[PDB]
Amino acid sequence: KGEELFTGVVPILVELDGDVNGHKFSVRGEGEGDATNGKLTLKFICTTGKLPVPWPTLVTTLVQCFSRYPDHMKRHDFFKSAMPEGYVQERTISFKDDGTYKTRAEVKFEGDTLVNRIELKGIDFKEDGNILGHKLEYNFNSHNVYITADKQKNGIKANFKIRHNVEDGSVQLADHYQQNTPIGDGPVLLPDNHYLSTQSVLSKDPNEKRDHMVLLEFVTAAGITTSFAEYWALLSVQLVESGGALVQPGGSLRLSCAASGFPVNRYSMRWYRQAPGKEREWVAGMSSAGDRSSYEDSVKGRFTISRDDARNTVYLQMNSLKPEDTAVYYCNVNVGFEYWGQGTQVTVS
Amino acid sequence: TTSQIPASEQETLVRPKPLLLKLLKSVGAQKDTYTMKEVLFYLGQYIMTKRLYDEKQQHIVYCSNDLLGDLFGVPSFSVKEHRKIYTMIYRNLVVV
């Protein structure tokens, strides 16, 4: 029933009130939402002067009922199920090595407009830091939001980590803990465990001189019909991973990565790596200008990232390789959309 | 693009302990010496042949009423826990 309100374009209106470290602000936003394509087009402005925190830190807080649920997942779209009564979205955003956001929002229809009213508090944000220092690049990465039913609260939970690009090459983690409860006492859909794949592009309107963020993002859901034969093959190759590049403990290796379609010397570049039984972890990176290069604590002192502008390539010299350095290595770049280089298996004895 | 020659024979040979060996033979295995991946093949083929995986959630394997339960020692498990299973498999075999 509630899914019949999202057929076709739907007007959206978003209103946020935020108190971060004492500094206060507000944001209004208008746009359309095509749940059929999982597409959002929204323009946001800071109605109260200029923003004390970066726009990328408010993206997640700034209506998952516009996510695209393919036909075979329509019994798991909690967000549309709760409409038009609405649902409450509470979340605790923990910026690593810095402050914490805390928000409460109500998403519900008002007439024929989907309205998100948000309250946001922020504490423990270092005055000279990535957030209040505006050290975050103006872009947004692609993330997977793992959703799971919360029977006792008659809603859903959601855990995920947002990776923000610091213009010094590093990455700012934002650990999201999320909870959603319907407003009306009517029937809602509790889903099997799944996830929401998200893509976002941040842009600016030239004719606007207010502090603004133009946002177009795509979201679709998946992850409920994976076969045992597939779950098993995943486990099998994990326990019997031969490897593509092998080195003794202490040896060295140099990773190459050729870029296509974009000038490598105008965007920041970063190296990720995913170890068996481990999640993707940022390794190294350098700024778009080339004046700054960052490294994670585990690799600092034996990794060096560089780039050849003419050959449009990025390198990763690896020295004194440990067995712990065994993983699949990826190159990353955000040209509005986040892109990944072909994986690279390095197997250290 | 560099390859190393000679390439090594880096396949783990194993001998399953009695119980695990019983399962592998029930599906068609006739050896008493296996590589690691041969073990995982016959074992996954065992779970599917015995229809022990949940149809709606196919990472859950129910083995409480099956010899596989004795092997792993659990009434049920999720193949998502690569770590935990890889251990149960080696407790039931020795590296030759």
Do B66 and B50 meet the contact criterion of CB atoms below 8 Å apart?
yes
Question: Could A228 and B36 be called an inter-chain contact, meaning their C-beta atoms sit closer than 8 Å?
Answer: no
* Separation between Cα atoms, residue A315 and residue A171, nearest integer Å: 18
Do B36 and B14 meet the contact criterion of CB atoms below 8 Å apart?
yes
Residue ranges of E strands in B1-96: 13-16, 34-35, 60-62, 76-78, 93-95
A313-318 β-sheet, strand order: A253-258, A313-318, A303-308
Which of A140, A138, A98 minimizes the C-alpha distance to A122?
Answer: A98
Q: What residues of A are in contact with residue B57 (Cβ under 8 Å)?
A: 192
Do A36 and A117 meet the contact criterion of CB atoms below 8 Å apart?
no
Chain B nearest-CA distance from A269, in A, is 23
Assign residue A223 a region (left: φ > 0; alpha: ψ between -120 and 50; beta: otherwise): left
Tell me how the structure was determined.
Answer: X-ray
Read off the tokens for A286: 């350098």
Which of A37, A1, A42, A8 minimizes the C-alpha distance to A201?
Answer: A42
Neighbours of A247 (CB within 10 A): 19
Read off the tokens for A118: 């948000």
Chain B nearest-CA distance from A242, in A, is 8
H or E element in which residue A90 lies:
strand A87-95
**Chain B residue whose CA is closest to A255:** B1
What is the 3 state secondary structure string of A153-199? CCEEEEEEEEEEEECCCCEEEEEEEEEEEECCCCCCCCCCCEEEEEE
* Separation between Cα atoms, residue A275 and residue B82, nearest integer Å: 13
Question: Could A227 and B58 be called an inter-chain contact, meaning their C-beta atoms sit closer than 8 Å?
Answer: yes
Pairing of strands A171-182, A87-95: antiparallel
Read off the tokens for A209: 């001189």
Measured in whole angstroms, the distance separating CA A145 from the mean position of its chain's CA atoms is 8
Chain A nearest-CA distance from B23, in A, is 17
Q: What residues of B are in contact with residue A234 (Cβ under 8 Å)?
A: 79, 82
B34-35 β-sheet, strand order: B34-35, B13-16, B93-95
Chain B nearest-CA distance from A330, in A, is 17
Nearest residue, CB atoms, A228 vs list B53, B83, B86 = B53
Q: What number of CA atoms fall less than 13 Å from residue B14's CA on the CB side?
A: 21
Identity of residue A29: G
**Count of domains in chain B?**
1
Assign residue A97 a region (left: φ > 0; alpha: ψ between -120 and 50; beta: otherwise): left
Place of tokens 């999202």: A6
**Chain B residue whose CA is closest to A238:** B82
Question: Could A240 and B37 be called an inter-chain contact, meaning their C-beta atoms sit closer than 8 Å?
Answer: yes
Do A254 and A329 meet the contact criterion of CB atoms below 8 Å apart?
no
Size of chain B in residues? 96
CATH code, A252: 2.60.40.10
Do A117 and A84 meet the contact criterion of CB atoms below 8 Å apart?
no
Q: What residues of B are in contact with residue A240 (Cβ under 8 Å)?
A: 12, 36-37, 40
Do A122 and A102 meet the contact criterion of CB atoms below 8 Å apart?
yes
Q: Which domain holds residue B73?
A: 1-96
CATH code, B64: 1.10.245.10
Beta pairing partners, A51: none
* Separation between Cα atoms, residue A307 and residue A227, nearest integer Å: 42
Question: Could A229 and B44 be called an inter-chain contact, meaning their C-beta atoms sit closer than 8 Å?
Answer: yes
What is the 3 state secondary structure string of A202-263? EECCCCCCCCEEEEEEEEEEECCCCCHHHHHHHHHHHHCCCCCEEECCCCCEEEEEECCCCC
What's A43's DSSP letter? E
Do A155 and A64 meet the contact criterion of CB atoms below 8 Å apart?
no
